[PDB]
Amino acid sequence: ARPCIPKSFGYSSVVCVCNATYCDSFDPPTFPALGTFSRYESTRSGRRMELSMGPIQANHTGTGLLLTLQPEQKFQKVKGFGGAMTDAAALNILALSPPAQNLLLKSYFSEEGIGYNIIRVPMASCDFSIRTYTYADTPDDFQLHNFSLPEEDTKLKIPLIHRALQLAQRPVSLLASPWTSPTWLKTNGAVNGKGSLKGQPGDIYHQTWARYFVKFLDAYAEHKLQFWAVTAENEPSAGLLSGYPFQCLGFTPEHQRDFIARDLGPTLANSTHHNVRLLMLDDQRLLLPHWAKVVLTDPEAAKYVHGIAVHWYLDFLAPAKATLGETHRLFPNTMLFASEACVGSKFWEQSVRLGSWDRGMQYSHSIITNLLYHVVGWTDWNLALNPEGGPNWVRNFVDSPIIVDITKDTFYKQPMFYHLGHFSKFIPEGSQRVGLVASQKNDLDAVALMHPDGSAVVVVLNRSSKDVPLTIKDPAVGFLETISPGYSIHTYLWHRQ
Ligand SMILES: O=C(CSCc1cc(C(F)(F)F)cc(C(F)(F)F)c1)Nc1ccc(Cl)cc1C(=O)O
Ligand SMILES: O=C(CSCc1cc(C(F)(F)F)cc(C(F)(F)F)c1)Nc1ccc(Cl)cc1C(=O)O
Ligand SMILES: *[C@@H]1O[C@H](CO)[C@@H](O)[C@H](O)[C@H]1NC(C)=O
């Protein structure tokens, strides 16, 4: 429909510039005839999910790289892709004029955009808030008589969530995560620093905190929002650390195990929200598989845990087989889900680097690594930030796929946005990862999936500067002959029947 308006900020690629009356977009999804394939391409040189089509060939000769689909090697099914409606994101979006807000929301959630189907919702304040608050700040209110949603929810996050769901054609799933409890539930009496829940699982502090989850879900249900899942706590290991600067609530794995078994699981299960899923961990994958063993080998906790949520800081490259892989091996029926990731903390770089192609590549490289190790979904952090990477009450600024420039009634879609969309637009909920084997060593990241309707999707990221010729073999249809430009990302789609 409308192409990227490119702007360079002097980094290696461009942003796409959007405002009240213009934003780049897609025509309605139009599917390739049998015997042909669709290609979407994004390049550092400036191409932005450009559509092309080509033929599937009956035969193939050559010594070039061959990727063979193995459609009967079946792995995980996909839940979805999306990002976090933090106070900061909601505040930034709503500071735009209304027509610009709608183009920003459509970019993420419309079929004219990249089809997000997950929204992560903080339960009260986090560092990407402009102030600290919980939903029950009256001291020692164990009955939660004064539990209340503030304007951050009722005027910023909830109205935006409603509009995102209105624009989406696919069902959107909401995921909720708390950063801190009320300070009067905590050993240290503060929203941050080293501190856990007072007392012992089963007792009044732990029951009150479990009930706070139900009150949150009650309150959101009164606003006609229902949740797919909640996490047990955001980054529980953070609250074990002296001086931790951000809202947090410490749990060892044993404390999480017992809080879930004694308080949170039973309280949710006996509520009208018993169908909400409970995810554990919601923390750096370096804590796996130990955290998973502690919680899931206790059947009184395991019966309440639907899944394991993981974070990653994309400024780092770290092991995945030994953490995600070994965890899946131990607990193959407990899904892994990436609930938060971000980039932009290296001291020698801007927190927001407008046009960074490297940062886009770190998104898709992470997404592909996650999918190759059983992860069912991938959730970005802030849906939008200002050009400083905020606001953030502790000045912990990072990057975001959409950057809002309030003074200009403009927003910029970063390479990260398009690297996300190469997955989110083309991998609907229920898609299943399948096998994909390489004929020789290569510098590509690739993953293959089958949609629910049977058709195929392959994402190829070229980590190198060289163009790489490659062929994809699908025994049902033949050969897809193509080239992967250096640094590029491609998504291929084709019918199989
Ligand atoms: O997380 C990491 C990744 S290890 C470095 C590494 C090794 C290799 C390999 F040798 F394997 F090829 C390739 C790459 C590549 F990404 F460039 F391709 C990077 N390291 C850091 C991360 C952040 C900061 Cl600030 C410092 C460090 C640090 O290690 O100095
Ligand atoms: O030691 C520190 C202070 S802890 C913060 C930290 C450490 C590292 C780590 F060193 F662990 F890699 C990486 C990052 C990240 F921003 F990349 F995520 C942040 N910082 C660095 C030390 C050396 C260098 Cl080269 C850079 C930094 C830097 O802060 O950017
Ligand atoms: C918004 O962007 C479009 C496309 O570049 C441009 O034609 C229009 O003038 C812009 N509007 C404002 C107010 O800058």
Side-chain angles (χ1 to χ4, degrees), residues 62-232:
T63 64
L65 181 69
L66 174 69
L67 306 180
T68 303
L69 190 76
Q70 294 167 339
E72 291 181 352
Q73 306 286 287
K74 302 297 190 188
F75 298 96
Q76 77 267 32
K77 303 223 189 78
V78 168
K79 178 70 188 163
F81 300 80
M85 192 72 78
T86 58
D87 297 340
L91 172 71
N92 279 312
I93 288 162
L94 284 165
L96 293 176
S97 73
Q101 306 172 9
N102 281 315
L103 296 174
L104 193 158
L105 297 180
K106 277 168 91 178
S107 292
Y108 273 131
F109 294 103
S110 166
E111 313 297 320
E112 309 176 14
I114 61 166
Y116 270 18
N117 63 344
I118 295 179
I119 303 179
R120 175 148 183 262
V121 180
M123 293 166 56
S125 66
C126 69
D127 53 312
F128 278 97
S129 307
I130 64 166
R131 68 196 182 97
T132 58
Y133 61 87
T134 77
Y135 297 135
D137 286 323
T138 295
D140 287 338
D141 183 16
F142 294 101
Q143 288 285 287
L144 301 170
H145 188 262
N146 290 18
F147 184 103
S148 189
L149 293 185
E151 303 193 8
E152 279 80 359
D153 301 83
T154 62
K155 304 296 184 179
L156 304 174
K157 290 151 62 175
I158 290 169
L160 290 185
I161 294 160
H162 285 304
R163 295 163 60 189
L165 267 48
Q166 296 172 339
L167 295 168
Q169 192 57 49
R170 294 183 173 169
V172 188
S173 287
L174 307 179
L175 172 60
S177 301
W179 267 248
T180 184
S181 61
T183 65
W184 47 273
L185 291 177
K186 295 175 66 173
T187 57
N188 65 325
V191 296
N192 53 7
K194 178 168 181 179
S196 60
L197 293 173
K198 291 165 71 59
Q200 298 302 336
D203 78 356
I204 183 166
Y205 304 95
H206 289 75
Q207 283 286 285
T208 300
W209 184 232
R211 285 186 264 105
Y212 181 113
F213 279 72
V214 169
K215 293 289 236 175
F216 166 80
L217 298 173
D218 288 347
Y220 264 62
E222 285 166 15
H223 288 266
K224 292 186 183 174
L225 295 179
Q226 295 288 304
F227 278 87
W228 153 72
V230 313
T231 77

Side-chain angles (χ1 to χ4, degrees), residues 286-353:
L286 305 169
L287 298 169
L288 297 177
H290 177 73
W291 261 72
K293 293 205 262 206
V294 175
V295 175
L296 295 180
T297 61
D298 178 349
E300 278 308 295
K303 62 182 179 186
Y304 298 110
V305 178
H306 168 73
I308 298 161
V310 296
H311 293 192
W312 193 235
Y313 279 101
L314 302 173
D315 288 298
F316 298 113
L317 297 174
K321 184 168 152 82
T323 54
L324 307 181
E326 303 187 324
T327 302
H328 171 80
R329 175 180 276 164
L330 288 158
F331 310 100
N333 295 311
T334 305
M335 58 89 121
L336 294 161
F337 181 84
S339 53
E340 192 185 303
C342 71
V343 76
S345 290
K346 298 181 174 159
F347 82 91
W348 71 90
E349 290 174 343
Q350 291 185 275
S351 308
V352 172
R353 204 169 146 100

Side-chain angles (χ1 to χ4, degrees), residues 444 460-462 466-470 482-486 488 490 492:
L444 305 179
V460 182
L461 169 70
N462 186 343
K466 318 174 173 308
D467 299 2
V468 174
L470 57 93
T482 188
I483 296 160
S484 166
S488 71
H490 286 186
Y492 294 91

Side-chain angles (χ1 to χ4, degrees), residues 34-55:
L34 189 57
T36 76
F37 65 87
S38 284
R39 171 197 298 109
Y40 289 83
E41 171 173 58
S42 299
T43 64
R44 188 175 74 171
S45 64
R47 292 175 194 282
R48 296 283 177 276
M49 306 182 68
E50 303 191 338
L51 174 60
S52 56
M53 172 269 281

